[PDB]
């Protein structure tokens, strides 16, 4: 490459909506169709949170507070029959969860769910700003239980819900193993209180713990 005259004047790509509002795959998972009537491998879960993969988590940690609608579009495949129909049930933060693929929770009227049959366009489900407070908090320097009990750094305001996914087909002659790819996307996003970027690598998906990393890459002397 060579250093060219990069002559233009624009910051429309640096706005918050043009920086955060990009769809990224945040959840791959497998789920069967038949066998093991009492099993946990016939449906998916994925509790919705921004701390899924480090690349997007890093961007969410530029800002302390942010509020945004989410508009996820699933991309569902299958391996190994009839034409298959799926169900992607979003439960709100206050919502019952299934324990099995044949639980009664799947029939709850307050849990919205899409019934996507195979072959069509991917299913798209949009969720508004659910949180109790006025913004989602990326960081919470506080304790969930009063008087400095356990569970540091976890507030219940930045709870977004869960996403239970199953086949609606009761059975099949052979085994069908479906794969789902949830594409998370912030929408109509506002952000408050900027924050310095992450320096150290991430350790765990529910905490801010880190190993002390060097500031920058080292050089030989101060003058070279």
């Amino acid at each position: 490459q060579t250093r060219h005259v990069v002559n233009f004047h624009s910051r429309s790509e640096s706005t918050i909506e043009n920086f955060m509002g990009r769809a990224a795959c945040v959840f791959m998972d497998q789920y069967k169709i038949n066998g093991e009537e009492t099993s946990t491998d016939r449906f998916a879960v994925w509790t919705i949170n921004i701390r899924e993969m480090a690349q997007l988590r890093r961007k969410c940690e530029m800002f302390t507070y942010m509020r945004f609608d989410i508009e996820m579009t699933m991309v569902i495949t299958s391996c190994q029959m009839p034409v298959l129909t799926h169900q992607i049930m979003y439960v709100p933060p206050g919502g019952p969860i299934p324990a099995k693929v044949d639980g009664y929770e799947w029939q709850t009227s307050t849990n919205p769910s899409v019934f996507w049959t195979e072959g069509n366009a991917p299913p798209r489900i949009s969720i508004p700003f659910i949180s109790v407070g006025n913004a989602y908090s990326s960081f919470y320097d506080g304790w969930s239980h009063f008087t400095q009990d356990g569970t540091y750094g976890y507030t219940t305001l930045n709870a977004m819900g869960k996403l239970y996914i199953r086949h609606v087909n009761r059975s099949s002659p052979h085994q069908i193993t479906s794969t789902i790819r949830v594409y998370f996307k912030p929408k109509h996003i506002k952000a408050w209180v900027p924050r310095p970027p992450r320096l150290c690598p991430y350790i765990n998906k529910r905490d801010v713990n880190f190993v002390v990393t060097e500031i920058t890459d080292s050089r030989t002397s101060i003058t070279d």
């Binding site: 060579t2 250093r3 060219h4 005259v5 002559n7 004047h9």
Partner: protein
């Protein structure tokens, strides 16, 4: 007869082909600020005269860096890594009345030339020898150098329909002088003057020189370049 002067360089001239109907001009930001030399730079830089015999196939110069050793322009190429200019190019021929011939004086922006034996490249000193011109050849050649055969000048095109560019015919029957103004054709407002060759002044004799056994065996072609509206990057802080 008009005696043009620019700075401390005066030539004697005898119609101008303004390249692409535009006259060169300046770029008109505090993030990037150009410096306009104006002083010097704009004077006439007369290259070495080129003898045109009966068997001469042609010549080419690659600018802006053909002027890389030409005074203050050639020296500002080394201190600024970005620039642009206009290059008024006079081409006299000062032949006699009994000589005959015809030249194509064309500028050809972005003349990407091809290697002589393909499947390889050339050692970068075959495109240009600063002031002196690389001649064409009458037939095909081999080796790690530019395929300089006329009828396929440099780019693999027909040499006859090379007239699409800013050109001027020098028919010794009628005229002797040519002048072309090339208003810096490039896709970026400024570019480095050593990496990129903005255009390629190539003079190609269509009708060959001819004369009898008493005249001089050659016709010297004189090339003169005046870098107009040269501007560079800024070296000062903001």
């Amino acid at each position: 007869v008009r005696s043009m002067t620019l700075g401390n360089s005066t030539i004697t001239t005898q119609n101008v082909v303004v390249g692409y109907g535009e006259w060169p001009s300046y770029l008109s930001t505090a993030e990037d600020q150009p410096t306009q030399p104006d002083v010097a730079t704009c004077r006439f830089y007369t290259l070495e005269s080129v003898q045109w015999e009966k068997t001469s196939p042609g010549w080419w110069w690659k600018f802006p860096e053909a002027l890389k050793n030409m005074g203050l322009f050639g020296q500002n190429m080394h201190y600024h890594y970005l620039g642009r200019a206009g290059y008024t190019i006079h081409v006299q021929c000062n032949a006699s009345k009994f000589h005959q011939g015809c030249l194509l004086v064309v500028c050809v922006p972005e003349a990407e030339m091809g290697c002589a034996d393909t499947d390889t490249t050339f050692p970068a000193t075959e495109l240009t020898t600063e002031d002196t011109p690389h001649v064409f050849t009458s037939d095909s050649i081999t080796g790690k150098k530019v395929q300089a055969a006329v009828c396929n000048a440099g780019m693999g095109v027909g040499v006859g329909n090379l007239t699409i560019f800013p050109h001027q015919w020098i028919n010794l029957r009628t005229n002797n002088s040519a002048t072309i103004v090339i208003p810096y054709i490039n896709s970026v407002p400024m570019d480095n003057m050593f990496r990129h060759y903005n255009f390629t002044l190539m003079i190609i004799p269509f009708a060959p020189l001819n004369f009898t056994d008493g005249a001089t065996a050659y016709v010297p072609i004189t090339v003169t370049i005046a870098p107009m509206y040269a501007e560079y990057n800024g070296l000062r802080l903001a």
